[PDB]
């Protein structure tokens, strides 16, 4: 029986590969060859945000493109004012081992988690005036790797239990669990319409999930090592993944295939963070080389280098308005580039 | 609206000052405490050494014991709420003072599993500068097992038959020579891994431990002294 099911799985895999090859009319490079290159993108460290004591594992921009939350392994969740390099809040965490941090799109809430296997939501805009824990989501059997707010009262958390979860914050319950990954889910990125999200795990595969329906619509293979970063294209029709195989690949949902690969021969280190520009033309990738690379998403040609970090770049992300990209690294410093 | 903006600017500066003061206090507290990662197998006995400095010293997914020796604070971290995969959550512990690797010396079946686990920490890109305080635990069981003679290390480690106890060995007063040869063979497998790479940015401190052993807190203190003394040699340009 097991052999028959495995044979059926192989047949289905062959059919899927044949369909993908059938819809591969032309490569992205063959269509963007005539495109004028972006040129050398020179971005300087406008502001460095100092005050974290250990390595920064995560950071998330606010919707206003002005506030910013950062997580560090000293049990501190510092909310900066990027414009004025001022720290609005510094939240002490119950467990110092924090790997993810989230900023609610409406403000008023910041989430974090890690080896505690708990997603902790903190209420900022409170009547008491002091940040306190509002909810302690404890349903995961592994370490949280990425948390993202759909909105208030709803959050999607990826964990090291090979599953993602959709949480109802008021009741503190798993509205829907997303199973199907065979490895540690490392990062999820929300679609602009909030209706979908892709999760990249340690099984070298990225899966597009349906938030409301609750099953994996498509799987995306092509990476040959653990995916550590995922990010949607500004329209929810493509996403970029970064793995320890030193390659970024742009997968498109409608084609159910990889479009083009962002790799260099000199690059032999993993990719930690991935984010697009507001127009999707630039693919900023954080690296273990203590530096970041800007990729022309349509040409896979390196545009620039963001080299200002002494330790590995752990988090990366552009503002909502696309003005600046913040880069937090293991050297306990967060830098805003522009 | 410049006058209204000045008020919010001053309030933001005051908030920044308060955050700075709290961060300096937690800064001092953060240096004063040394962070230890506890690693091992299910049968390694890490909990016993976690308890023996929790019942004889200061003392959900992460088991934490805050023990103090010689007025120096130590934080131990037993990560037990996770899966068998540890290639992504082990990278959190690249700033720890040391890794307390506990090995069941008696269990020859899972010795290779411990040795492969030790290699991965030693050769990892993010842990290649973190010293390991190796704890060859359950030496009471190792002594009984060797005197019994039913199970032979040669089956699991064929190079044992040509191994001789080093001159540097310090056997216990009532220790059988068979135990001493068995004891230092297990240590030399881990030291062979440790001495293979790591340059000078990495050291392994091997200690023999039992469940009744009550000096492990002192051992970690002395090794952490040597770990931080070694860092200060480079950080103060002595080396």
């Amino acid at each position: 029986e097991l052999d028959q099911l495995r044979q059926e799985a192989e047949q289905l895999k062959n059919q899927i590969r044949d369909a993908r090859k059938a819809c591969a009319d032309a490569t992205l490079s063959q269509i963007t060859n005539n495109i004028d290159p972006v040129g050398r993108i020179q971005m300087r460290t406008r502001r460095t945000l100092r005050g974290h004591l250990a390595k920064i594992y995560a950071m998330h921009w606010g919707t206003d493109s002005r506030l910013l939350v950062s997580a560090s392994q000293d049990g501190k969740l510092i909310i900066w004012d990027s414009y004025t390099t001022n720290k609005v809040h510094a939240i002490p965490l119950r467990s110092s081992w924090v790997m993810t941090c989230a900023y609610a799109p409406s403000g008023n809430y910041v989430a974090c988690g890690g080896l505690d296997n708990i997603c902790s939501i903190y209420n900022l805009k409170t009547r008491e005036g002091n940040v306190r824990v509002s909810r302690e989501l404890a349903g995961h059997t592994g370490y949280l790797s990425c948390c993202r707010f759909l909105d208030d009262n709803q959050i999607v958390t990826s964990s090291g239990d090979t599953t993602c979860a959709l949480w109802d914050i008021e009741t503190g319950q798993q509205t829907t669990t997303f199973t199907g990954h065979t490895g540690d889910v490392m990062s999820l990125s929300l679609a602009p319409d909030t209706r979908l999200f892709v999760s990249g795990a340690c099984d070298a595969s990225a899966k597009l999930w349906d938030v409301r329906e609750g099953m994996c619509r498509q799987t995306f293979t092509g990476h040959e090592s653990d995916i550590n970063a995922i990010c949607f294209f500004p329209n929810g029709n493509a996403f970029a993944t970064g793995s320890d195989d030193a390659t970024c690949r742009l997968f498109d949902l409608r084609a159910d295939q990889e479009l083009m690969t962002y790799s260099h021969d000199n690059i032999i280190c993993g990719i930690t963070s991935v984010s697009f520009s507001k127009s999707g033309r630039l693919l900023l990738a954080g690296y273990d080389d203590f530096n970041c690379n800007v990729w022309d998403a349509l040409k896979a040609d390196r545009a620039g280098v963001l080299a200002g970090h002494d330790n590995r770049v752990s988090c990366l992300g552009v503002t909502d308005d696309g003005m600046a990209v913040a880069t937090g690294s293991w050297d306990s410093f967060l830098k805003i580039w522009n | 609206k410049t006058e209204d903006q000045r008020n919010e600017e001053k309030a933001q500066r005051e908030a920044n000052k308060k955050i700075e003061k709290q961060l300096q206090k937690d800064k001092q507290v953060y240096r004063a405490t040394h962070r230890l990662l506890l690693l091992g197998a299910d049968n390694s006995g890490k909990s016993t050494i976690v308890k023996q400095m929790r019942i004889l010293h200061g003392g959900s997914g992460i088991f934490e014991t805050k023990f103090q020796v010689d007025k120096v604070n130590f934080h131990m971290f037993d990560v037990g709420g996770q899966r068998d995969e540890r290639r992504k959550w082990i990278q959190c512990f690249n700033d720890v003072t040391a890794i307390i690797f506990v090995v069941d010396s008696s269990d020859y079946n899972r010795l290779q599993e411990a040795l492969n686990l030790f290699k991965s920490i030693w050769n990892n890109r993010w842990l290649r500068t973190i010293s390991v305080i190796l704890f060859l635990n359950k030496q009471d069981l190792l002594a009984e097992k060797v005197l019994a003679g039913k199970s032979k290390i040669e089956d699991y480690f064929p190079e044992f038959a040509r191994y001789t106890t080093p001159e540097d060995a310090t056997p216990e007063p009532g220790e059988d020579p068979r135990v001493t040869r068995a004891k230092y063979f297990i240590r030399d497998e881990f030291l062979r891994i440790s001495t293979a790479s790591g340059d000078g940015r990495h050291y392994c401190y091997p200690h023999f431990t039992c469940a009744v052993d009550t000096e492990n807190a002192r051992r970690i203190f002395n090794d952490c002294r040597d770990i931080i003394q070694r860092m200060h040699l480079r950080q103060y340009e002595l080396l």
Partner: nanobody, 127 residues
Framework: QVQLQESGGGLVQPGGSLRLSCAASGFTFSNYKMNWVRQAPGKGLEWVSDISQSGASISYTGSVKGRFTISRDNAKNTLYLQMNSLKPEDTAVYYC?????????????????????RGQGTQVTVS
């Protein structure tokens, strides 16, 4: 898609010989340190041998030393394991696991219960 398909197992008398191949695909085979892992009936996963990115750095578990030879053919993307003088203790399902990351000196999770790149498995039954 990272696929590691192994073949060659079967029933062989004690003191027999089997060669276990591994048709590796979906990744640059020359950048990863391949391994051989066996799960005996009723026992946990046990690492048998590993080979570096090249033919050098061949290491074996104590039980298989002297009678198992690991080999790698990067041109054909094949990992081999020549087992001689098989003992009944060698009855297990042999998996060909690869490194999680390329060009690394560490094999963290290769004997894990659910590892991404280990292969379906091939059964050798010596009796």
């Amino acid at each position: 898609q990272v696929q590691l398909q192994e073949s060659g197992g079967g029933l062989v008398q004690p003191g027999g010989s089997l060669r276990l191949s591994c048709a590796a695909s979906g990744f640059t085979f020359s950048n990863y340190k391949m391994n051989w892992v066996r799960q005996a009936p009723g026992k946990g996963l046990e690492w048998v041998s590993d080979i570096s990115q090249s033919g050098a750095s061949i290491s074996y578990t104590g039980s298989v030393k002297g009678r198992f030879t690991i080999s790698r053919d990067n041109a054909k993307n094949t990992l081999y394991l020549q087992m001689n003088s098989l003992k009944p203790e060698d009855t297990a399902v042999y998996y060909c696991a690869r490194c999680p990351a390329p060009f690394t000196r560490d094999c963290f999770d290769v004997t894990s219960t659910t590892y991404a790149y280990r292969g379906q498995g091939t059964q050798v039954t010596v009796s």
